[PDB]
Amino acid sequence: DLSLYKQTVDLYLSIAPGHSRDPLNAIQEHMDSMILSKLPRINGIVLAYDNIRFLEKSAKVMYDSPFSFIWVRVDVLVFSPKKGDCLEGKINLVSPSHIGLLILGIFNASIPRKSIPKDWIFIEPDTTEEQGRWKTNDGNILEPGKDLEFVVDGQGTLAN
Amino acid sequence: LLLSLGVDPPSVVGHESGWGCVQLDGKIVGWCTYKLAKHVADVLRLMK
Amino acid sequence: NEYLIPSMMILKALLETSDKEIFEGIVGKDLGNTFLTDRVELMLRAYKSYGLYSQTETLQYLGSKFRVVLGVAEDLTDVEVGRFLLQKVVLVHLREAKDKFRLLLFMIRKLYALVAGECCADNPDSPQHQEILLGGFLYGQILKEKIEDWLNSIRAQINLDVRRSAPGVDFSDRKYLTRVFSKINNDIGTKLQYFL
Amino acid sequence: KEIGEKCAFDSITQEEGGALKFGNKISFRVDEVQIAKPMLSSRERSSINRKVYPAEARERLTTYKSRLVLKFSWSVNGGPRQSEMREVGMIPIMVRSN
Numbered sequence: 001d002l003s004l005y006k007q008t009v010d011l012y013l014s015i016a017p018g019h020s021r022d023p024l025n026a027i028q029e030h031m032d033s034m035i036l037s038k039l040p041r042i043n044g045i046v047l048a049y050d051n052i053r054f055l056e057k058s059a060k061v062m063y064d065s066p067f068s069f070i071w072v073r074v075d076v077l078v079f080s081p082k083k084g085d086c087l088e089g090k091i092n093l094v095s096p097s098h099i100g101l102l103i104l105g106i107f108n109a110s111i112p113r114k115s116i117p118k119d120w121i122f123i124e125p126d127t128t129e130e131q132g133r134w135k136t137n138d139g140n141i142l143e144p145g146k147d148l149e150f151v152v153d154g155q156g157t158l159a160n
Numbered sequence: 161l162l163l164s165l166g167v168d169p170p171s172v173v174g175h176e177s178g179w180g181c182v183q184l185d186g187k188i189v190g191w192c193t194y195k196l197a198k199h200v201a202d203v204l205r206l207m208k
Numbered sequence: 209n210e211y212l213i214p215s216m217m218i219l220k221a222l223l224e225t226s227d228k229e230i231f232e233g234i235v236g237k238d239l240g241n242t243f244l245t246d247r248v249e250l251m252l253r254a255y256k257s258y259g260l261y262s263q264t265e266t267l268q269y270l271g272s273k274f275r276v277v278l279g280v281a282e283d284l285t286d287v288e289v290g291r292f293l294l295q296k297v298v299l300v301h302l303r304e305a306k307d308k309f310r311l312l313l314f315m316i317r318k319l320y321a322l323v324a325g326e327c328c329a330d331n332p333d334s335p336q337h338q339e340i341l342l343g344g345f346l347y348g349q350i351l352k353e354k355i356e357d358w359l360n361s362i363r364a365q366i367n368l369d370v371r372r373s374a375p376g377v378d379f380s381d382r383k384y385l386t387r388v389f390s391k392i393n394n395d396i397g398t399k400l401q402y403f404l
Numbered sequence: 405k406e407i408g409e410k411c412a413f414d415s416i417t418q419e420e421g422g423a424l425k426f427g428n429k430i431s432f433r434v435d436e437v438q439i440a441k442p443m444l445s446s447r448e449r450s451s452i453n454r455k456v457y458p459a460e461a462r463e464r465l466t467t468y469k470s471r472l473v474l475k476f477s478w479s480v481n482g483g484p485r486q487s488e489m490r491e492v493g494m495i496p497i498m499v500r501s502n
Binding site: 172173176179181185187188 | 233237299307310311
Binding site: 281282283343344351352355356358359360362363366367370377378379380385389394395396397398400401404 | 412413432467471492494
């Protein structure tokens, strides 16, 4: 669905003293650290950030730390999969205890057989024991059906 | 090839004094005098 | 265990053969070769001393004599036990009993020739009379051995399953087969790894 | 194949019968042996289930084994002889081999 989110947040950034010539320098310096790392304040993973502008306060310096602090406004791109609704992924590993899916080619999904309706069955091949087809109740085979659509619980669910 | 070559497996005893036995890895297939034996050997390796 | 059964016994048991057929196969040549003739006669006579005549009687006698060390199906019959022997031990490389018989003839013939110095002693202590064992081959052989012990173990489990009183006795329910499959130890790969 | 098959049943003592009867006879045998490649510790671990090259088995100091499958066949003293695969463990594999 529309699981993508962009949110302009305001943070209390710690400007190093050596980058006193330009704050934007040290701002992006650690801003490149937040990317792809979960911002727990919003409980999502940083995907993009722009509009690096500070509420101009000529940052107040700590009482005993030379690196100062200031409030800055930036616009994050967190992706919130908070068990909202139907999402979809490409299956990468398939074995009759859980299914491994990739959402957006990055994030992982382990839908266990219990959250899967019992009616679907697995075939355990000859070349591979576990790398095989969790053929659905319908009999439709799932590997070439690389995309699987499902609902999220937090972690996935196939039971209807 | 052995049958076409001068030996034969008998049913009732096709065996006499100067006749030698030929063995295919533990299976009697025929008999021939030793001259025929050596000649068969030579021609067979030659075919091989 | 070593086991010694008279050659003449297994001979007449192998093929529905007349003793004249034996004699004319063993030494049929140069009619009246002294040594071969008198020895062969003694052999036929010493077996005749106690033995039986037709092939089936000897087959049944053999089966009834050897049904124990055989792990064969206990219930079926007795003459098929003898055929089991004749197929399973005597000359396993061969399959046609008449051909086995011809070769046994050739073999005892060569043996007698060796008795009278008519042939030099083969040297087993020479790479002439010798071949090599590989790894994969012995690997397959021991593997087959464990296969068979596994089959015999699961058969034994089904047997004791019947034997207790009748805990579960239904050779038609796949559930029962699942239960007994779990009942036996279903790992052998560790056995081969163990040996290696 | 040259192993054959094994029988089991309920033996009723003959007791002068001579043909000690038995009905529920099962004769089972393995149809074939399946040796697959040594997959990665087969049971899924939420990763791309790949293979294990022997170098790794050297490193982790572990034997180099691959699953072993039998094709078990039945008989209910009729003609059912349906099949099923039984894993009987994992056995080693030699380097560079087939």
